[PDB]
Amino acid sequence: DITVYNGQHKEAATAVAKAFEQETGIKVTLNSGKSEQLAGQLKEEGDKTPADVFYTEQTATFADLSEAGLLAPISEQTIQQTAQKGVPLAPKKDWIALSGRSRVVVYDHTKLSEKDMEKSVLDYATPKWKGKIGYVSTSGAFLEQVVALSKMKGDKVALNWLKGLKENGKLYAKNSVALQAVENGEVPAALILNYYWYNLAKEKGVENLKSRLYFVRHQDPGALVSYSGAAVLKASKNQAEAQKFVDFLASKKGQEALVAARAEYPLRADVVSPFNLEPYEKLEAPVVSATTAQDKEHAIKLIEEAGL
């Protein structure tokens, strides 16, 4: 039986954990928490941790754990299962990316069309969009978006974007509220995460929604994908079962269980989402280094300096 420290959404974790038990007979116990809290706890526990596997919504928490020497190598065969072009790869082969979530632009298709849309996320934070673009400054995904912009285009561009959103954007408390405002006719478009919209569409039928999705693509900062993944703890006294769980997550069946429970992009090339997501490769996600905590603190300074 194994212990999984779980930073991912509980419906995702529960659903892969149950398909695991069904396929192998091995019981999974989840210890859930925020990924950053869990990584800290895994570093304090060190070689005395009870964790066998760390399952996270964000692969960036792996870099420090790897560098601290706390992750076990994963099979090369397993790593190759999700190693599409653009997918982050552990240089020490000691964690694996499993699924992604994308930034998108949701729009009311009865007020705007694909041809009104912009080639860059940078273009939405300008006067042509005054009163017409929703954003959510308090979101974890928003913070990540800032970091990527800072890294790809430098700090002056990121700050200019944030100032533009302040001047021109409609601020919403959460991604789901932003979507509702677009559906309700309050704002014709917003910046959100893909899965809020696919969830609504799965539930309602696309033909009954005013809103549609525009993906920026061509490796723009607004095509940013954030990746979930897993690692085996080097200190686990149950390596065999831990490695079997991680291989299962990379397997066709494990990936099929994830995408049944949650509208993330599978990273296996032979699995299709029941939410009707495009193939990962069509996203043309940019290549961006991992978000450190210093990166997150930096983005918060830019958000503050912008009056947000």
- Residue 308: count other Cβ atoms within 10 Å of its Cβ: 18
- Residue 114: count other Cβ atoms within 10 Å of its Cβ: 9
Convert 291-306 to b/e letters by CB count within 10 Å (16 or more is b): beeebbebbeebbeeb
Distance between CA atoms of residues 10 and 29, nearest Å: 12
298 labeled binding residue? no
Q: Which residues are within 8 A (CB) of 159 and not within 5 positions of it... i.e. 6 or more apart?
A: 302, 305, 306
Which string of DSSP letters, residue by residue, matches 107-131? EETTT--GGGS-SSGGGGSSGGGTT
| Torsion sign, CA atoms 280, 283, 288, 290 | negative
9 labeled binding residue? yes
Say how many residues make up the chain: 308
Distance between CA atoms of residues 72 and 243, nearest Å: 9
Asked if 183 and 210 touch (Cβ cutoff 8 Å), the reply is: yes
Q: Which residues are within 8 A (CB) of 122 and not within 5 positions of it... i.e. 6 or more apart?
A: 149, 153, 157, 161, 221, 222
Q: Which residues are within 8 A (CB) of 245 and not within 5 positions of it... i.e. 6 or more apart?
A: 2, 4, 20, 26, 28, 52, 53, 230
Q: Where is the binding site for Fe cation, in residues?
A: 9, 57, 195-196
Q: Where is the binding site, in residues?
A: 9, 57, 195-196
